[PDB]
Amino acid sequence: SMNPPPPETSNPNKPKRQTNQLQYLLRVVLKTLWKHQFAWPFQQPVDAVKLNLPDYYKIIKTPMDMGTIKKRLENNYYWNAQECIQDFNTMFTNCYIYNKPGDDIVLMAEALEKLFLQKINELPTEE
Numbered sequence: 379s380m381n382p383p384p385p386e387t388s389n390p391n392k393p394k395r396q397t398n399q400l401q402y403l404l405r406v407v408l409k410t411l412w413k414h415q416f417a418w419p420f421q422q423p424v425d426a427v428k429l430n431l432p433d434y435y436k437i438i439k440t441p442m443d444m445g446t447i448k449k450r451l452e453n454n455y456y457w458n459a460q461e462c463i464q465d466f467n468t469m470f471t472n473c474y475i476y477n478k479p480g481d482d483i484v485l486m487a488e489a490l491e492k493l494f495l496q497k498i499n500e501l502p503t504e505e
């Protein structure tokens with residue numbers, strides 16, 4: 379099996395805006411996770427071909443990763459902060475669905491998710 383194409387990251391047919399919350403999601407939330415020592419396997423779509431995981435995309439139908447999230451933020455793809463928060467949650471949940479507790483990748487996701495929740499608890503005020 380091939381990989382699927384990556385998630386869309388730019389769409390000129392969607393209106394665009396900058397907001398305090400979206401800026402914070404890029405500058406604080408995404409940055410903090412991106413620079414973390416456990417970021418690597420979450421920095422791009424799961425490459426099921428290279429990883430030899432023929433069932434990955436049989437199981438995970440809503441893939442998401444931080445590379446995609448970073449590009450979406452940079453390209454003003456999200457209008458509301460909750461759209462971006464949902465993408466992070468999808469990323470973590472996919473890891474937990476596909477893998478097993480105690481797997482090294484799950485321990486890494488759990489560490490990143492803890493930091494994510496910490497930073498989201500300090501979202502700035504809405505316009």
Ligand SMILES: COc1ccc(CCc2nc3cc(-c4c(C)noc4C)ccc3n2C[C@H](C)N2CCOCC2)cc1Cl
Pocket residue numbers: 418419420424429431472473476477483
């Ligand atoms: C430039 O070369 C690379 C670039 C990216 C990757 C992907 C890394 C990766 N991407 C990964 C993605 C997952 C993953 C995730 C995330 N959710 O389910 C699974 C399975 C789990 C592990 C992942 N891993 C770690 C893999 C297996 N091994 C890489 C070689 O060193 C030992 C570790 C690999 C290589 Cl060799």
